[PDB]
Amino acid sequence: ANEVIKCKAAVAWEAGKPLSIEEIEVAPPKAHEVRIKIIATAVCHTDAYTLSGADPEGCFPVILGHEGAGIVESVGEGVTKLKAGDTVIPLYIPQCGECKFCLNPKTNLCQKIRVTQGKGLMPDGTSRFTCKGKTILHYMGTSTFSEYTVVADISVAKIDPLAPLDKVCLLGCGISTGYGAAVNTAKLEPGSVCAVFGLGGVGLAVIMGCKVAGASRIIGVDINKDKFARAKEFGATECINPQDFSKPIQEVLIEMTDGGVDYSFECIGNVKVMRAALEACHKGWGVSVVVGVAASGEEIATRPFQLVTGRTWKGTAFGGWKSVESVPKLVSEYMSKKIKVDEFVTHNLSFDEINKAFELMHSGKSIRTVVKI
Amino acid sequence: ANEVIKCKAAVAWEAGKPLSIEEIEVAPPKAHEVRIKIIATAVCHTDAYTLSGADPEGCFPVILGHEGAGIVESVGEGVTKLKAGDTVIPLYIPQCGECKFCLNPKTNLCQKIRVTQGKGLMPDGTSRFTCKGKTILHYMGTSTFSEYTVVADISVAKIDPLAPLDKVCLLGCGISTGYGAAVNTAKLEPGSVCAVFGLGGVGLAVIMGCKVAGASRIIGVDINKDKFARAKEFGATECINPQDFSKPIQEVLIEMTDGGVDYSFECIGNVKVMRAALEACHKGWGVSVVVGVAASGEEIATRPFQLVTGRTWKGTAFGGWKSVESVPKLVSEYMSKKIKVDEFVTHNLSFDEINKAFELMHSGKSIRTVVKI
Ligand SMILES: O=C(O)CCCCCCCCCCCO
Ligand SMILES: O=C(O)CCCCCCCCCCCO
Ligand SMILES: [K+]
Ligand SMILES: [K+]
Ligand SMILES: [Zn+2]
Ligand SMILES: [Zn+2]
Ligand SMILES: [Zn+2]
Ligand SMILES: [Zn+2]
């Protein structure tokens, strides 16, 4: 049958500390669970956020990581859609396909296993990870920073067997979220004028999506000019540095587009930028999409007049993609060269050097660092 | 040859004081202007809001009133589509039909004459009103509180000649705004679950709209239980008084609807309630609409999480109706008994008793008081 697996994993023993490569034990999959051999994983700002200890919802010890790609090692009882050998991507936003949310076309926020996932546990209320006699928690239902992870069977996307995993693992969060924010949440029309705040991975995917949608103008906004070049390569028609102006960035964009942009996207998680992103939208029909995850407690604000006169404030989680359905298609779009993925990889590292991925993120030198398990 | 007209008008010489019935002069229509004989007018909370002085940009002396219906008395140079005798409704939201706003299907906010109108002046930068050697300012481009008023030729809706003016004057604002908020802004689908905050004329019109759109549950919310009976009559499936509960109203609504409403409308102009209305919306697809009625002066707020997890914050002005082409149709819908108007009229007064219309409103014992000129 399926035996316990002894492998390595990057364990987060405590908030504020770097990850530790430990020898852990991964229990076999129980009913409706699948054990996956992680081949490649990357670091998202959210992983770092939780690791810092700033996340009031974060618990330790825990195995982080939610951008990964691997191969099904084994499945539990009741699982028939997935089998050993299947090429897959773990999903932090599952798709049971039977709940109120999955059944509603307007959302992708499946709630079937949210409760247990938030507690870093499998649906049955227990963890599949142990290390040196201690229970180690799951993270975002994925825990991709391990040679082997166990996820709910509704948290799995079966993808093209030929997809390069050291690439598509990025579709686990960043690229998909940004891309979807443009084509799913905003659904911008050809010819639209867009503004993108934050030119990191997510921001670049937004630009990518805006270009796929046929936007006439895509204005990149970032205080770090070093990110401009790549933003342009992705489709940005122009980039502006807020520090180069002496007035509110909103005013700069308004004057720059004769009224404001048709669509703006905040990809940083900064509440002040979110407000500016909203107010930079054109009167009457402007739409602003919050893609970034702001620190707990922080709240956004603006004057109701902004909404009364036509602006709309929206947000998105994982680009609004119903995970199980979409991810395989997104991988196919990458395979057929409809969207870019490779362009997001700025660095490559081995599992033992996973901490450098975190460092490269803070230094803001990279977009995405792919970790080879 | 149009001459100066000596007539009666309700002038607001200053804020915080009752309107003064004065004898004024109304200059003839200059190029592209229309002089209308007001037959009936009503008082909207906005009129009282300006009068109270609580409005930052409120200027005096001025002739208030923006809910009116009348007959074209004469037209200025260049006016070809309108003539003496035409049945009309003045519009505070114009429709030049050629600026970028009028040409865009996503908005009704024509900007052609915004600037001058905001200053209580006609497009040429001057006022047609005078009284006792003093120039009196126009209001919202309509100034219906006069036997005769002059408006830009793009601020005029030509309506069905058979329409009872002592009725359709309410379509100048309140009814149209609430109704449009439901069918244009929200565009709620049949079966939708709704919540309406503020059960005044606007709220009742929103309820009527929700009913026309085929909403399943329509929850009226107001701290004044006296407004419940009429709300039910308009279609509210039930009403709740926030004061009958300890927990925040959004928590109450969330509990009542197993997650929150699909659409919520704030019809009071209170930023705290606006936040409640937004958070009272269901996760994933909830949409809250701020119905333009004030200029609160303050700001609205919430946690980005609300938007990230699916809720959408919108706003509306005059229900998003492209005024010149819509008002006539709304009149036709009332004529065809598709929508209600008569049910909004709770009191009737003569022009001389116009101040009483303001009293009935502040005491919240009334929906709409139609003033017969
Ligand atoms: O289903 C739910 O209740 C909540 C779903 C959470 C989705 C919001 C995304 C927050 C940031 C994490 C992903 C980006 O790194
Ligand atoms: O400034 C513009 O272009 C359009 C105007 C936006 C104002 C919204 C209307 C609110 C006025 C009070 C409600 C009617 O008494
Ligand atoms: K759109
Ligand atoms: K809708
Ligand atoms: Zn992420
Ligand atoms: Zn589900
Ligand atoms: Zn116009
Ligand atoms: Zn009004």
- Please answer whether residues A112 and A154 qualify as being in contact, where contact means their C-beta atoms are separated by less than 8 angstroms: yes
CB pairs under 8 A between A and B: 111
Nearest alpha carbon to residue A173 among A37, A304, A267: A267
Q: Quick check: B217 and B193 in contact, CB under 8 A?
A: yes
Q: Respond yes or no on whether the N-terminal peptide bond of residue A56 is cis (omega within 30° of 0).
A: no
Q: Measured between beta carbons, which residues in chain B are less than 8 angstroms from residue A313?
A: 307, 312-314
Out of A104, A290, A312, the one facing B314 most closely (by C-beta) is A312
Q: Please tell me the distance from the alpha carbon of residue B84 to that of residue B36, in angstroms, as a whole number.
A: 9
| Residue among B102, B112, B293 to mutate when testing ligand 2 (max atoms within 8 A of CB) | B293
Q: What are phi and psi of A352, to 5 degrees?
A: -60, -25
Contact B300 A305 (CB under 8 A): no
Report yes or no: A274 and A266 within 8 Å, Cβ to Cβ: yes
Helices first, then strands: H and E counts in chain B: 12, 18
Interface of A with B (CB under 8 A): 100-101, 104, 106-107, 109, 259, 269, 271, 274, 283-285, 290, 292-294, 297-317
Nearest to B320, CA basis, from B5, B101, B84, B157? B101
Structure-derived torsion over alpha carbons of residues A212, A213, A219, A225, reported in degrees to the nearest 10: -20
User: B156, B138, B152: which is closest to B71 by C-alpha?
Assistant: B156
Both tokens assigned to A51:
């690791």
CA distances from B58 to A139, A265, B20, B46 (A): 55, 35, 17, 11
Identified catalytic residue from A33, A35, A41, A66: A66
Q: Are A169 and A87 within 8 A, CB to CB?
A: no
Q: Which fold is adopted by the domain A178-316?
A: Rossmann fold (3.40.50)
The closest of B163, B141, B150, B173 to B7, measured between CA atoms, is B150
**Under 8 Å CB-to-CB from A307, ≥6 apart: which residues?**
A313, B290, B300, B313, B314, B315
- The alpha carbon of B318 and the centre of ligand 8 are apart by a number of angstroms equal to 8
Domain ranges of chain B: 1-177+317-373, 178-316
H helix runs in chain A, sequence order:
45-52, 100-103, 114-118, 165-168, 174-180, 201-212, 228-234, 249-257, 271-279, 305-308, 323-335, 354-362
SS3 B257: coil
What strands, in cross-sheet order, belong to the sheet with A5-11? A5-11, A20-26, A129-131, A134-136
Quick count: other Cβ atoms within 10 Å of Cβ A81?
12
* Distance of alpha carbon A286 from alpha carbon A313, whole angstroms: 9
Would B1-177+317-373 and B178-316 be classified into the same CATH topology? no
Which architecture characterizes domain B1-177+317-373 according to CATH?
Answer: Alpha-Beta Complex (3.90)
Alpha carbons within 13 angstroms on the beta-carbon side of residue B222 total: 25
- In whole angstroms, give the CA distance from residue A29 to residue A4: 9
Flag if A299 and B298 touch (Cβ within 8 Å): no
Residues in chain A: 373
Closest by Cα among A291, A294, A261 to A279: A261
* Structure letter (DSSP) for residue B12: B
- How long is chain B? 373
Distances (CA, A) of A171 to A96, A162, B252: 20, 15, 39
This structure was determined by X-ray
Q: Which residue out of A173, A239, A267, A281 is catalytically annotated?
A: A173
Determine the atom of ligand 1 nearest the C-alpha atom of A44: 15
- Closest alpha carbon to A27 in A1, A5, A49: A5
Give the nearest partner residue to A101 out of B284, B314, B315, using CB atoms: B284
Structure tokens belonging to residue B342: 């008569």
